[PDB]
Symmetry: D3
Subunit: 286 residues, 6 copies
C-alpha cells in the first residue's frame, strides 16, 4: 500500500528495513527532517533540505546526492503514493562500518524517504510540565543538529507522560528556557512576544514562518532569554513545529496561563499560519 | 556464514535488518552492551546483563524476557556460530510505533544479539590522545551512565580526534572535570598512586571495576576522585579501559609526552593481571 | 489550649502573633529547627540547638540567650503543655527594624518555641516522587545548609510535586547533582550498598546523621558521594530522612517503579533500627 | 498614630501583628511591593499592582481580591493616615495552615497595606559599592523576578557590603554576569551610551522601566545586554534604580573610582528628568 | 639598530631589559596594546590608548602619564627608528615591589614602547585561508580574569596555541565558561551564513579595535549583522568564517575541526571585507611625520 | 650585596634584569616556586623542585637542566649570599622569541634563582573576605600550575585591600571554596578538619606537611568540598603556604570565627609545624 524510498528503490512499508550494522542504527549516527505537504504542495521544502544538509555538515556526514536530487526524490515518493496531504521524513545515515565508533570506516550512507498521509487539543489547548532533565548542551551534542539521537527528547516526554503534561518544556545547561520536546516555544505578555535565541534549541522552520507573520502584523517581538517566571506569568504561551503547527499551552506546572484558554494573539497567529500553508509550497503534480 | 539472533530467529549477517519504523532506529531509542568471549568463556556475562537491564530501566524500557533467558540466548548465539573468542553486542530497542517520539505508542521491543569473531602493536608503543572541545553529555540531560543507542556525542569526539591527530579523544564534563574517553574509562598514575573519576559523569565500566579489584588486590594506593587537565598532562602514566580495548596505555596527550612516552610499569603490570583474569574466569559456552 | 513561648512569656496559640515589622516576617530573616519528643524524651535536642546556632551564625544573627537557656525554654514549653510525644519548632527572628533590608537597623531578635502534639499508611505502600525543574538554592547564593525562614525554593518544588502526581519532590543542584527532597535528605540502595550526596548542596540532617550511624553499626557498605538521575532510576531502594518523616520509602520516581515497587528490605531494617533509637535516647522532659 | 490595613480593618502600627502560623512568616511564603506617593499622587500604582499579581501567580498564590479593589484599599490606607508623600508596602501571605510546607493546607491569604511617611546628601557625593561573593538567587531555582518575602539572598549581600565598606552590594548571577544591587537595578554609562542587564537574572524594576522611557525620549544610545565586572570597573558612570532609592549614583566600585569619582553628567540629567516625572504623574489620592 | 622607549630613555633592543623584581614580570601584573603604523600613519591610535587606560583601570593600575603624553611617546619612538610601517607594543607594568603579590608595595610603574618594522612581503598571504581547531581549555572567565583586560597574563591564550600546534590548526578557537563561542587565541571571530554576519558579544572575549572597524564596514555595506551568542554548530555550518586583529587584519578560516567551511576557500563576503579594510588602513590614522 | 643566579652567572639585585622580549615578561609565560631555608636547611627542597617540573610540563616548557642541577644551583645561590634563613624564588621562563604568542618560536628558557633573607598578626589572627572573582578554572588556566600568570590572585588581593581583609578567599567556577590568594585553606569544626580537594586550587607543600601532622596527631581529617556556610560556622579556620606557614583566620566577611581568637587546634598545628621546620631539610653548608 505505502512505499518508502530506500537507496534508489521503492519498498513497501512492511519491508522497509535497514542493516543493523548501519551506524545510523547502532549509534543514531544520522540526520532527519520533518516536512508537510498541504493540498498538493510541499511547505518550505527548500528550507528543510537546507537544514538537512546543515545537520549532516555538523556531524561531518557527506550526503551522497545533491539538494536538487533530494527534492526530486521527495516529490517522486509523494507521487508514487498519490499523496496530497502528508508528513515527510527524509533520513540520511552514516552507513555500514565496523562495530567501533569511527565514522571514517563507514561506507555508503543510506538515503530514506518516508511519506505518511495526514488527515479537541487546539480548541482547549495543551497542558505542559517543565522537566528535570536539561536540553542537550550546545557544547556537547548541539540541539541545532536534527539527528537520530533523540533520547534527551524522549526522556523529557517520559517525564511529561508520568507527570500529567501533554508536552514537556526543557531548560538549558545555563538555566534558560530552551524548547518543548519536539517544538519551539513562544511567550506573549502585554501584547509583546518573546522567544529564546536558537542556540540552545533548534532553528525551527515553523518558528521562522511565525516570526515573519508576527513582524508583518506589527506585534512587538524580541528574541531573548526567557525563564520559568516568564512562562508562569505569561498572558499566552504557544509551541511551534511541523507536525504541531501552532499549539496553545494553557497550563504550565499546574498554573493556568492567563485565563486558561487559547489566547487572542495565539488564535490570530493560528489563522494566519493556516493561510500561509494554503498558499505556499513546491507543487507535487504538474 | 555468521548468524545474528533477531527476535527468536537466527538470521545471516547480510540479512540482519530492522524496520526503519523501530524507534531504536528513528530516535536511537534503545540500549546495548559490549561483551567478550575468551577461550570458550563469556567474561563477566552477568555484570553486563545487569547493566543492560539498568540501562533499560533508566529509559523506562521493559525488556520482554528475563535475565536468565537473555544469558541463554547469548550462549546459544555463540554456539550457533561455533565461536570461542568473540565480541558480543546485545541490543534491545523500543520497537515499532508511529512517527512521533512518544514511547507509549511502541509495542514489541526487539531483542538482537550480534556475535563477531575476535582474534595490538599499538599497545607496545601506546596511544596518542587529544582532549576534545565538546563536553560529555550531562548526567542531568542524557546520562552517560546509560549505554544507549544515542552515541553521537562520542562520535563527535572521535571525529575531533581523527582531525586532530589522536588515536583517542578525552572528554571533560559540563563542570570542567575529566570524564572518560570516547569509548573507555580513564585512569591516571602519579607517584605510585592511581586515580580515576567517580562514575557519575561517565559510565560504570565493567573493565574499570575489574581493574579496580586488581589494583586493590595488589595494594596500589587508589582513590576515586575528580581529575583535571593538569593531572593528565603531569601524570607518570595514563591508561584507558573497556571491553574491546582491555587496558590501553596513553603515552601522549595534547602533544605532551606522558612520563617517558612509553607504556608505564604500573600499566604493564595491570595489563598482565587483566589477561590472567580473562583466561581463568567466565560463563562456559560449551561445558 | 496550647501555649507558645514568645519572648519570655507563655501565650495561647490563638494569641501567638509577631509584629509585621519583624524582618523575620518582611524578608524571612530568621532561622528555625524541627525537633521531636518521643515518650517524654527530646530526641537529639543538643544537635538541633547546635544547628540552630550555626544557622544564625551563617546569617550573622546573634541569638540573645545561651544554648543551655534555649534548651530549658524548650523543655519548659513541653512541660507547660503536658506533652510527651510532640513536634517542636524553635524560631529566632532578626527582630523589628525599619522597612529597608539592612539588618543593622534591627534591635531585639524574637525567640519563639512552638510545641504541637504528635500521634503512616503511606509507609507500608511507600511514596511516589518526581524530580523538579527548579534546582536547589545554591551553596554560593542562599546556602541550603542554613535552615532559615526562606523556604520558597522548597515550596516551589512542593507545588511542582502537587501538580505532577508526586507525594515528594526531588531537587538537583546548580551543577546537575542530586541534592535532597523538598524537606528531607535522600539515600540510594544498590546491590546491598548505600549512597547519599555530600551535605554541601542540601542540609546536614540530624536524621541523616543518625541513619548513617545505624548503617555503619550494621556494617552495610556506605559511601557519601555525588548521585545523579540515573542512580535514582536504577536503584534497588530509595528512601528519604527527616525529623517529621523519620525514614520514608520512595517506591516510584518519575513514573519508574523502584525495584519491585514496594518498600525495600534494607529500608525496612533501617526503619526498625531507627524506631528503637528514638525509644531509648533523648533529653528527659520530666524529672 | 499610623494605621495599617490588615484583612479588612485599620490597625495601629504597634498592634499590627500576624499569626506565627501564617506560612508568610514560617517560610516567607508571600509576595510584596514597594510603592511611592508623591504630592498626593501614587506613582505607577497600576504597574506595581500588575507586578504584585504576577509575583503571586509565579508562586501559585491566589490573591483573594481584584486589582481594582487592591488599588482602592491602598488609596484608602493613605487617606486614613492623611499622607501625601509616603512609602507603601502591600503584602499578600499564603495564610495559616499546618506546620508542613504544603501550600494546599493554607486557607485564607492575608492582605496587608503599610504606609509610612516619606520626607539625599549621599546623592550629591554618590555611593560606594562592593561586588559580593554570593551570587544572586538563580532564575532556575528561586526566580529573582518574584518579589517575595524570601529576601535572605539580598540580606546576605547587604551583610557583606556592611562588613566590606560599601553603601551598596552588587551581585553577579549563576553564570558570571552582572545582575543588580541588593535592592535596585544597575545601569552602566560608557562613551555616551547606556547598558543594563536583561531582566531575567534580576527584577523587572518599575523605576528601571521609567528610566529606560526617559533614556529613549532623550535619544541616548541604549542597549539591554549582559555586563561583566570589567564593564563596572571601566564605566564613565554607574547608577542604581529603585522605588526607595530613585536614581542613586555609584562613584566607587571595589576601591576603584568610577570616572572622576563624582556623579556623572548623564546620571544627573536622568535624576532631574525622573524628579519631573514623579511631580507630574500618578493616581490622585484625594478628590 | 632599533630603539625601545623605556622610562624616559631610548635603549637599544639588546639592552632593553626590566628588573626581575617588577611585578609585571613576577606575576604578569601589567597591561599592553598592539598597534599598527601604515604608510606613516598610526591606525586608530586614540582607540588603542583609550583601551590601554581601561585595561589599567580594570586592574587598579594608575598610568603615571596622560593619554596625550603616551601618544607623543609612541610617535617619538617611531620617529627615532624612522619607521613608516610598523607594529607598536606599548606596555605599562605595576613596577618594582617586594616578593609578595600585594600591589600596594609597588612604586613606579614602568612605561615601555616597542616598535618593530612591518612588511607585507607578499599581498595574498591569505589566498588559501587558515585551518582552525576548537580547544578543550575554555577562555578565562569574565568573572575570574576578565578577557576584556589586555594584560600580561596570556597563558590561557598560549595553552590554546599549544593545543592548536599539536592538533594541526593554524589557529585555536575558544568556547567560554558557559559553552558559547568566545574568540581565537589572539583575534575576534565572525561567522557568515546566508548573506548575514554574526559575532559574539564582547563580554567573553576582547573589545577588538579591528572588530569595531570591521563592524563599521559591514554596516556601511548594508550586510545584515547581529551581535549574538554563537555555538560550535554555527562554526561548522557557516558559509564563511574569519578572524580579526591588529597583526592578522582579516584572516579567513577555511577548515574547522576537520570540516571544510563552505567550499574550503576564502569566501566572497570575507574577500570584500578584506579589500575595504585595506582601503581604510591606507586612508586613516595619526600622521607620524606630518 | 645580594646576588641573583641568572643563566649561569651571579648578578647583583640592582642589575638582575630580563629582556623585555622574553615571553615570561610579555605573556607571563613561565613557572616559579616559593621555598624556605630554616637554620641552614632548605625545607622540602625536592618536593618544590618536583612541583616546578610539573608546572613546566603542564605548560609544555622544557627546563634545560636536571632536577639535581637545579637543586645545586639553589644551594649555591644561598651559599654565595651566606644565608641560613631565607626565601627562595626559582623562576623558569619560556625565553626570547618573536612578538607573537607561539611558544615554538622561543628557544632558550631563562633560569633564575632569587634568595632573600627571612627574619603579632599570628597572636591575634587575620581577617578575611570572600571575593567576587572566582578562581581561574581548572579547565581554563589550571591553578595547579604555579605560573607567572598571577593576575587572578592580584585581583582578589585588590578586593581584600579595598574591603578590609588581610586575606582574600576564592570560590571556584562551580561555587565551591577554593583557597586564599596565596595559600590553601582548612576548616576546623567539632574537632574535625576539612580542606578542599586540590583540583580547584594548588597542591600546597605546606598543606601536604600539615596533613601529615594532622594524621600523626590522629585528628579526624577529610578532603572534601566546602562552601561559604562551612567557613562562616567553623570553630577555627587557617591558611597554609611557604611564606605564611600556618596563619589563623579569625574573622570572615564580618563574622567572628568561633571566639574570634586563634583556636586550640590551629595553635597546636602551628607548634608542630615549627618543630618540623627545625628538624628537616637539605643542608646548605657541608
Ligand atoms: C562511553 C563509554 N565508556 C566506557 C565504556 C567501557 O565500559 P566496559 O568496560 O563495561 O566495556 C564503554 C563501552 N565501550 C564501548 C562501546 C561502544 C564502542 C566502543 C569502541 O571502543 O568503539 C566501546 C562506553 O561506550
Ligand atoms: C527538538 C525540536 N524542536 C523544534 C522542532 C520544530 O522545528 P520545525 O518548525 O522546523 O518542524 C522540532 C521538529 N519537530 C518534531 C520532530 C520529530 C518529532 C516531533 C514530535 O512531536 O514527536 C516533533 C524538534 O524535533
Ligand atoms: C532585588 C530588587 N531589585 C530591584 C528593585 C527595584 O524595583 P522597583 O524599581 O520596581 O522599585 C527592588 C525593589 N526595591 C526594594 C525592595 C525592598 C527593600 C529595598 C531596600 O533597598 O531595602 C528595596 C528589589 O527588591
Ligand atoms: C595560589 C596559591 N595557593 C597556595 C599556595 C601555598 O603553597 P605552598 O604551601 O606549596 O607554598 C601558594 C604559594 N604562596 C604564595 C606565592 C606568591 C605570593 C604569595 C603571597 O601571599 O604574597 C604567596 C599560592 O600562590
Ligand atoms: C585575546 C585577543 N583577542 C582579540 C584581539 C584583537 O584585538 P585588536 O583588533 O584590538 O588587535 C587580540 C589582540 N591580538 C594579539 C595580541 C597579542 C598577540 C597576538 C597574536 O596573535 O600573536 C594577538 C587578543 O590578544
Ligand atoms: Cl549535555
Ligand atoms: Cl539573557
Ligand atoms: Cl572535586
Ligand atoms: Cl541559586
Ligand atoms: Cl562527583
Ligand atoms: Cl551575552
Ligand atoms: Cl576561568
Ligand atoms: Cl544566547
Ligand atoms: Cl561535593
Amino acid at each position: 500500500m505505502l512505499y518508502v524510498y530506500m537507496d534508489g528503490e521503492f519498498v513497501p512499508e512492511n519491508e522497509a528495513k535497514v542493516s543493523i550494522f548501519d551506524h545510523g542504527f547502532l549509534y543514531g549516527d544520522g540526520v532527519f527532517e520533518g516536512i508537510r505537504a498541504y493540498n498538493g504542495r510541499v511547505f518550505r521544502l527548500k528550507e528543510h533540505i537546507d537544514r538537512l544538509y546543515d545537520s549532516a555538515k555538523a556531524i561531518d556526514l557527506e550526503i551522497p546526492i545533491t539538494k536538487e536530487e533530494f527534492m526530486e526524490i521527495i516529490l517522486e515518493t509523494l507521487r508514487k503514493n498519490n499523496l496530497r496531504d502528508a508528513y515527510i521524513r527524509p533520513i540520511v545515515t552514516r552507513g555500514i562500518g565496523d562495530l567501533g565508533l569511527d565514522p571514517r570506516k563507514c561506507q555508503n550512507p543510506s538515503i530514506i524517504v518516508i511519506t505518511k498521509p495526514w488527515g479537541d487539543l487546539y480548541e482547549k489547548g495543551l497542558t505542559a510540565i517543565t522537566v528535570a532533565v536539561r536540553r542537550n548542551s550546545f557544547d556537547a551534542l548541539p540541539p541545532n543538529i536534527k539527528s537520530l539521537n533523540y533520547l534527551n527528547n524522549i526522556l523529557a516526554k517520559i517525564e511529561a507522560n508520568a507527570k500529567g503534561g501533554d508536552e514537556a518544556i526543557f531548560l538549558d545547561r545555563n538555566g534558560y528556557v530552551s524548547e518543548g520536546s519536539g517544538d519551539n516555544i513562544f511567550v506573549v505578555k502585554n501584547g509583546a512576544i518573546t522567544t529564546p535565541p536558537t542556540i540552545n534549541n533548534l532553528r525551527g522552520i515553523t518558528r521562522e514562518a511565525v516570526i515573519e507573520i508576527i513582524n508583518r502584523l506589527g506585534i512587538p517581538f524580541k528574541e531573548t532569554n526567557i525563564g520559568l517566571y516568564d512562562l508562569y506569568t505569561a498572558d499566552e504561551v504557544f509551541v511551534t513545529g511541523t507536525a504541531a503547527e501552532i499549539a496553545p499551552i494553557v497550563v504550565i506546572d499546574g498554573r493556568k496561563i492567563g485565563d486558561g484558554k487559547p489566547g487572542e494573539i495565539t488564535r490570530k497567529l493560528m489563522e494566519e499560519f493556516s493561510k500561509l500553508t494554503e498558499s505556499e509550497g513546491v507543487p507535487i503534480y504538474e
